[PDB]
Design a protein around this nucleic acid. Structure first.
Lengths: 610, 330, 171, 380, 45
DNA sequence: TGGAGTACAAGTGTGAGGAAAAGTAGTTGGGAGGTGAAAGCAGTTGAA
């Protein structure tokens, strides 16, 4: 045994470099910290499938909707045969429908036969307890909780000729005390809201609650999470909430409030490990592996590791690993908000000696987020693990074997409308473009045969003259309209405004059209220093803008050639805002509106200061 | 997902704690006047309690005079029906000053229904928004065993104004697990216990937000988690250069006269001396009666570890270690 | 940030070179059924130089130079508000040894006091002293003198002899 | 507050001239726009004026000098340049005034800094107050260059450019008076109209109905099923452009919508450039020897073998290069399970279209139904 | 050119109005005044 | 056939929920302060 304890608590957070030296002079690891050392552990999925089928809150009175663990029935309490893995889950409309073999993975059976008992209430919890290794068997019964009742079932003597799973029953014992019950455990032992009782299970399915019970009722706890488990078999139950753990012995008269977690934490989940002594507790901010005590099995709180993720809906599953010199305990926490996982690898040695390794995480399937994750007992440093999930907004049950070695409904159910007169008239535009695309490929192909001709050169000669008349008219249209103190088209022509096909040759026109003007009232904005928001980089020429756009649509189009010409030309029909007046136009209005405000507004209208 | 070191404060989460802790008090003061016959509203509620300040949870061990009898007085519907009406009917006047979702949040948490919208989501600040991005990738790359990238995230995270002690010292394995061009990691723990170490009393009446005792502060009767970390990691490193006198003098200077875990390591300094010095390489005047101090310092400093509160040591095994040191003393 | 003060700083600042005094109490109520232990700060008690509680304690003459001291810094004194003061040594009576002394100031005390008397200065292990004087009176009476709270109490010897153990009159 | 808002107005306009090369006349266009909103201040008496300014007021009166010059810059580029901290928008109260800060009260400093980002179409709604407090109609021209808009939107999704005109025939068919996708004005009250009256947002709803109509209504069987899987995962491929990593910052800031926590599946190299971007947040954004001793032990630059001097020829591919990986990936060019597999690309074009334009889902969903039952409406 | 010297780190230092009397490199309160090029005369006797 | 109710839509009207740097609130926990003798020897009164 090491050195680190306190008698009530025992801590080892992430990379604290914990407090357990001893200085052993044995010349092989002269320190016995609460940490191991080895190589990595990367996790890869082995994906399979098993079965299928206000808004800002969640009701904590639900616990599970599925369970699956190895069973040993009466015929397996008689014969050599030991072990058949089953599944107990829910399906249907509101989850009120209640209903195998391992080839290499877990799979539903060949005879596709489930046991459909009809239930008249929504299902809140489905579990089978599992038995202890001091009773030698694996329990054949199953306890579930509905919204309106509390029903206990039992599997009895399944077949192999048709894989028939049949059920006996206990009756639905309705709420004679009219309060909703929260979490059951067997290991009719029940936890109602605030109070509890110990029940008696009958072997008689041919036609109950004892006079020993109690309560933990906290008047200053406003949620309704409650939780009971048998602890160390000596008739000791552990009754929880999101505030505290009470240890209650229901055989003697001896109650103890052990844990009290109101200050800066709560209690999120408490999974009872199938081991008789070692059991984990998940709180927020910390993962606790508080086991039982060696001398007197009451409670002994052991080494724990802190947990950074914070949420109100955190749970845990925990799967053992048996190895010769030690026992691992992986710890998968999960939530209802995200798809992520968080795992930690503890270790149990022979002298109740605990250690730690570290933490990792994996990814999942993008339809919703998980709500419950269940591991496989698997009937018994190249680690392996197996489990199965169930996501929210879904009802499929996948399968995973982790080892050391997005379509939204509103984007889909909004279109494709089902009328008769409106069945092909939406495609009238589809027939319209086929009337225009076949047109506008022949209208351009007039100009494509025109290459360095005189027959296309005379268009631009008329183009430099048809813009030149109405623009000097427009220049003097702004001097007559200058006494205003109160605009750009480049569609003044009406010939085609499409009848020339060259990227370098129109730049010879427009730059000569730029060398046309030198007087006032005419100003042209840049194009070789202002186009560049599309390539997001240098555009040294308007011609070499097209160059990499020619290197862009080679494989994706028929002939790939003239469309990239005409869109670059259409930017010249769209980006060319070239009718800004000269400096008399801002200056006559940068002082006139400066006069509409007084001297208070003058100095508070100020630039050119930094 | 992870915990974010932000002092994020919204009035919506501040009124709904000013709304709930008001409702806890009237229904607990109601339970006072039924069990006998059978102003801030949050500073009043915590006066019942005692915050742990050494632990996240006040662990009350069972094998003591903390035993209790079972109240078999269970709660039925007819006790639960009128103990909650008149505190709900007495809550009715501030429930219109609150927002339209706070009253809906309240009647949700009047009947259980633990919420689902966490405060880390809807802040929309652009400065806390890059905090929450950088904290998760910080915890991811340390988890993903990636150290050059996590050292770059953590150098960027600490330079944003608003961050806390939370990210600072816990994941400072990034210097401890680098060890290539390192600052050795122990100079940063020296940075922690030189500026944050204060011996103030834990005043417990003010409502603590964004600084929490058990893992980032260092008051009286609570040695800091980073202070005792700088004790153990500078004794394991002190072995692994084979300076023990440099720390045996250094531990001697604080009288941490409450806790017992610093007295074991102050015994464990001399226990490493009495293991290293007791070699002598002969096959004899001062080296024999110098170790006779170091055996006597381990024996008296282990007793004062037992004299203080709960911290058990294997003092049966240590005397098997110390007598094996004596076998070369003779 | 917590730093470390050297006595060269206490001479420029003209301040006292003080170390902090801590003093843990035992507030017990109803004779040990509920104890309340609290260490408390009792102010700075000035500190003698190159003692256990100075930072110049076991420190090279190289390092006394690097901390603004003389290389053979002597120590043995206190710094109180800049002024550099020490405690005079006193010659007192030898401890734990009775001294047969005649003194003319023994008959000052009144009637029948002779000039004779034994005097012992007994110190405790905490170096705190308590002087007993054993007078001889001329009537044959022998008394016992001690002090308590600046006051001086004369008692017979055979009330102090007989309260120490079970004494006969031959013993 | 009007004084310090002009200095921050002067400094945002200064960078667009200094690096990104918006012209030296473009400062003068917004200046009268800043001068005629002062006449709206002159329209109210100075006693209890209660002026309505916010941090969206500096994106708005920059936006109405932009498309008046018919520039190819839009709110898609005003949502990148503020989130990637390129022009002083967020924390503009911290470093800008340097003298007027000491006299500025506790709510004239918080309004003036980038406290919240524009959300649920907040950016367009200040343009509505900018088109009402001065009428942007009958003074300037509210025409947009919509071909500079659709030129950018093709190479973002890397469909063949056939859809440029196929989108264009959609817009010509629905718009009364085919041309003139104009900006709306609102001078009346606080009642933002539920019509999506803004010009650029109308183009985005016109573009949503193109990619459904040109693929679901195709009897020609020209578009194969191998191409659908090769345009989905040609658009679902993360790389190292200064656009896609500037896209990563905009994905951060918005908390409500999905694809907000997109950083859980980032690659190695994509995370480093998010931290190489973090050398552009600290330049905007007695107890100093404490942090100096911690900044010493955590140097922000790499402790050895850095990435500035002797690094590479190149690491970062340019914006023109991924299209040679986006267009060369789709070699296929020459059913009830296809009309749902049209939605695998319909929602994947949607996610890039919500967060890069700062509207919610229903601000586009209801924008569809004001257009979907208005283009079919003309026939019957 | 304003010049003091801190007595701990010997880092030369200027001290304006509304400052603490502390060094800027270290946190030291005692801080001594330097001498500049200024004329003093002596009979060499 | 000539005349009434289904609901596509649309503008009218009213407050509410959100943000932050500042301030005042509530405790502590330090600090320097400030609110007579060694011996005479005489005169005088001492006292039952």
């Amino acid at each position: 045994l090491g050195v680190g304890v306190q008698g009530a608590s025992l801590y080892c957070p992430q990379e604290n470099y914990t407090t357990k030296k001893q200085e052993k002079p044995q010349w092989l690891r002269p320190v016995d910290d609460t940490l191991a050392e080895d190589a990595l552990d990367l996790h890869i999925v082995v994906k399979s499938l098993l079965c299928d089928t206000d808004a800002f809150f969640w009701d904590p009175t639900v616990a599970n909707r599925l369970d699956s663990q190895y069973i040993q029935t009466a015929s397996d309490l008689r014969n050599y045969r030991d072990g058949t893995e089953i599944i107990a889950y829910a399906s249907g409309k509101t989850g009120s429908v209640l209903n195998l073999t391992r080839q290499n993975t877990l799979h539903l059976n060949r005879h596709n036969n489930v046991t459909s008992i009809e239930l008249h209430s929504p299902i809140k919890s489905i579990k089978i307890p599992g038995a202890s290794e001091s009773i030698g068997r694996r329990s054949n019964l199953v306890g579930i909780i509905t919204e309106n009742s509390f029903q206990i079932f039992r599997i009895e003597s399944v077949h192999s000729r048709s894989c028939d799973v049949m059920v006996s029953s206990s009756e639905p014992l309705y709420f004679v005390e009219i309060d909703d019950l929260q979490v059951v455990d067997f290991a009719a032992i029940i936890d109602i809201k605030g109070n509890w009782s110990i029940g008696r299970i009958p072997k008689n399915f041919n036609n109950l609650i004892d006079n020993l019970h109690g309560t933990i009722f906290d008047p200053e706890e406003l949620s309704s999470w409650k939780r009971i488990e048998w602890f160390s078999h000596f008739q000791k139950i552990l009754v929880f909430d999101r505030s505290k753990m009470i240890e209650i012995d229901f055989m003697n008269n001896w109650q103890t409030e052990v844990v009290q977690a109101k200050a800066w934490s709560n209690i999120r989940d408490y999974k009872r490990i199938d081991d008789k002594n070692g059991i984990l507790l998940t709180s927020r901010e910390i993962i606790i592996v508080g086991a039982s005590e060696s001398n007197d099995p009451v409670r002994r709180i052991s080494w724990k590791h802190d947990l950074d993720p914070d949420d109100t809906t955190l749970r845990i599953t925990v799967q053992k690993v048996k190895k010769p010199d030690h026992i691992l305990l992986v710890a998968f926490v999960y939530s209802m908000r995200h798809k992520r996982i968080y795992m930690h690898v503890f270790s149990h040695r022979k002298a109740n000696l605990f250690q730690s390794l570290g933490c990792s995480t994996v990814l999942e399937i993008p339809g919703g987020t998980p709500t419950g994750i269940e591991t496989i007992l698997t009937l018994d440093f190249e680690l392996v693990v197996d489990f199965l999930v169930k996501l929210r907004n879904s009802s499929e049950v996948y399968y995973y074997a982790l080892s050391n070695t997005v379509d939204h409904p509103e984007w889909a159910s909004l279109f494709n409308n089902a009328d008769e007169r409106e069945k092909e008239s939406i495609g009238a535009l589809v027939s319209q473009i086929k009337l225009k695309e076949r047109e506008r490929i022949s209208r351009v192909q007039n100009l494509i045969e025109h290459e360095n001709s005189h027959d296309e050169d005379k268009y631009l000669q008329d183009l430099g003259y048809r813009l030149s008349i109405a623009t000097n008219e427009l220049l003097e249209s702004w001097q007559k309209t200058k006494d205003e103190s109160i605009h750009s088209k480049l569609k003044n022509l009406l010939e085609n405004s499409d009848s020339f096909a060259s990227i370098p040759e129109f730049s010879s026109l427009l730059d000569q059209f730029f060398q046309y003007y030198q007087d006032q009232d005419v100003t042209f904005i840049g194009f070789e220093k202002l186009l560049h928001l599309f390539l997001h980089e240098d555009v040294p020429g308007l011609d070499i803008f097209y160059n990499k756009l020619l290197q862009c649509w080679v494989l994706v189009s028929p002939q790939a050639e003239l469309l990239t010409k005409e869109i670059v030309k259409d930017i010249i029909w769209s980006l060319a805002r070239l009718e800004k007046p000269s400096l008399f136009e801002p200056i006559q209005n940068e002082i006139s509106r400066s006069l509409s405000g007084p001297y208070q507004d003058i100095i508070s209208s100020w630039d050119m200061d930094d | 997902m992870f915990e974010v070191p932000i002092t994020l404060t919204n009035r919506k989460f501040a009124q709904r704690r000013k709304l709930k802790y008001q409702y806890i008090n009237y229904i607990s003061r109601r339970f006072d006047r039924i069990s006998k016959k059978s102003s801030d509203e949050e500073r009043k509620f915590w006066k019942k309690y005692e915050k742990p300040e050494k632990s996240f949870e006040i662990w009350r061990t069972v094998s003591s005079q903390n035993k209790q009898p079972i109240n078999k007085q269970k709660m039925t519907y007819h006790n639960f029906k009128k103990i909650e009406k008149i505190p709900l009917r007495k809550m009715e006047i501030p429930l219109l000053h609150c927002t339209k979702e706070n009253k809906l949040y309240f009647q949700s948490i009047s009947r259980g229904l633990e919420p689902l919208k966490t405060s880390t989501s809807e802040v929309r600040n652009y400065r806390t928004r890059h905090i929450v991005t950088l904290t998760d990738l910080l915890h991811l790359n340390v988890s993903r065993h990636n150290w050059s990238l996590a050292y770059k995230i953590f150098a960027t995270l600490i330079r944003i104004p608003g961050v806390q002690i939370k990210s600072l010292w816990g994941i400072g394995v990034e210097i401890l697990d680098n060890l290539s061009n390192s600052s050795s990691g122990l100079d940063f723990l020296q940075w922690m216990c030189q500026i944050y170490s204060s011996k103030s009393r834990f005043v417990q009446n003010i409502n603590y937000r964004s600084i929490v005792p058990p893992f980032q502060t260092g008051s009286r009767t609570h040695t800091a988690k980073f202070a005792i970390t700088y004790l153990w990691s500078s004794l394991i490193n002190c072995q692994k250069s084979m300076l023990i006198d440099k720390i045996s003098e250094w531990v001697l200077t604080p009288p941490f006269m409450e806790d017992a875990e610093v007295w074991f390591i102050y015994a464990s300094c001399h226990l490493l001396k009495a293991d290293t010095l007791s070699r002598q390489f002969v096959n004899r005047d001062i080296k024999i009666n110098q170790v006779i101090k170091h055996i006597h310092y381990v024996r008296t400093f282990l007793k004062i570890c037992l004299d203080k509160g709960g911290f058990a040591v294997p003092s049966r095994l240590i005397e098997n270690q110390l007598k094996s040191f004596e076998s070369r003393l003779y | 940030v917590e730093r470390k003060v050297y006595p060269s700083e206490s001479r420029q600042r003209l301040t006292s070179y003080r170390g902090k005094l801590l003093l843990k109490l035992k507030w017990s109520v109803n004779n040990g059924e509920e104890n309340l232990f609290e260490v408390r700060d009792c102010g700075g008690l000035p500190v003698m130089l190159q003692s256990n509680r100075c930072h110049l304690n076991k420190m090279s003459p190289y390092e006394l130079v690097q901390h603004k001291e003389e290389s053979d810094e002597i120590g043995g004194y206190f710094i109180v508000n800049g002024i550099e003061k020490l405690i005079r040594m006193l010659i007192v009576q030898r401890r734990n040894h009775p001294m047969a002394i005649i003194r003319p100031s023994f008959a000052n005390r009144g009637a029948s006091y002779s000039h004779y008397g034994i005097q012992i200065r007994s110190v405790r292990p905490d170096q705190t002293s308590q002087t007993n004087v054993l007078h001889y009176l001329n009537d044959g009476q022998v008394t016992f003198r001690f002090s308590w709270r600046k006051n001086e109490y004369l008692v017979p010897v055979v009330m102090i002899l007989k309260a120490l153990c079970h004494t006969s009159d031959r013993e | 507050f009007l004084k310090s808002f002009q200095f921050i107005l002067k400094r945002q306009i200064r960078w667009l001239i200094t690096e990104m090369r918006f012209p030296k006349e473009f400062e003068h266009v917004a200046k009268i726009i800043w001068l005629k909103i002062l006449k709206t201040i002159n329209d109210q008496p100075q006693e209890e004026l209660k002026l309505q300014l916010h941090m969206t007021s500096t994106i708005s009166i920059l936006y109405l000098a932009s498309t008046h010059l018919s520039l190819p810059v839009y709110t898609c580029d005003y949502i990148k340049w503020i989130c990637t901290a390129k022009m002083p928008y967020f924390q503009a109260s911290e470093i800008l005034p340097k003298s007027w800060r000491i006299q500025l009260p506790n709510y004239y400093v918080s309004i003036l800094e980038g406290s919240i980002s524009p959300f649920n179409g907040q950016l367009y709604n200040k343009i509505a107050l900018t088109c009402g407090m001065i009428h942007f109609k009958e003074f300037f021209n509210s025409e947009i260059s919509c071909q500079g808009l659709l030129l950018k939107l093709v190479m973002q999704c890397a469909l063949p450019p056939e859809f440029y005109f196929y989108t264009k025939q959609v817009i010509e068919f629905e718009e009364t008076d085919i041309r003139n996708l104009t900006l709306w004005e609102r001078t009346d009250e606080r009642h933002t109209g539920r019509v999506s009256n803004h010009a650029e947002l109308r183009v985005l709803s016109y573009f949503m109905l193109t990619i459904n109509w040109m693929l679901s209504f195709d009897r020609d069987r020209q578009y194969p099923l191998k191409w659908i899987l090769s345009l989905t995962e040609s658009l679902t491929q993360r790389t190292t452009t200064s656009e896609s990593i500037g896209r990563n910052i905009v994905k951060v800031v918005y908390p409500d919508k999905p694809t907000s926590s997109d950083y859980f599946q980032w690659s190695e190299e994509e995370t480093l450039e998010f931290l190489k971007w973090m050398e552009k947040q600290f330049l905007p954004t007695d107890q100093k020897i404490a942090r100096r001793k911690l900044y010493k032990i955590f140097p922000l630059d790499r402790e050895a073998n850095h990435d500035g001097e002797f690094n590479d020829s190149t690491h970062q591919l340019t914006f023109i290069e991924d299209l040679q990986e986006r267009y060369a990936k789709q070699t296929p060019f020459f059913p009830p399970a296809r009309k749902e597999a049209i939605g695998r690309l319909l929602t994947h074009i949607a996610s890039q279209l919500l967060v890069d334009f700062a509207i919610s889902k229903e601000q586009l969903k209801d924008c569809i139904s004001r257009i979907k039952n208005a283009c079919l409406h003309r026939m019957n | 050119t304003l010049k003091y010297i801190c007595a701990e780190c010997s880092s030369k230092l200027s001290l304006s109005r509304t400052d603490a009397v502390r060094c800027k490199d270290c946190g030291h309160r005692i801080l001594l005044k330097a001498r500049t090029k200024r004329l003093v005369q002596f009979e060499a006797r």
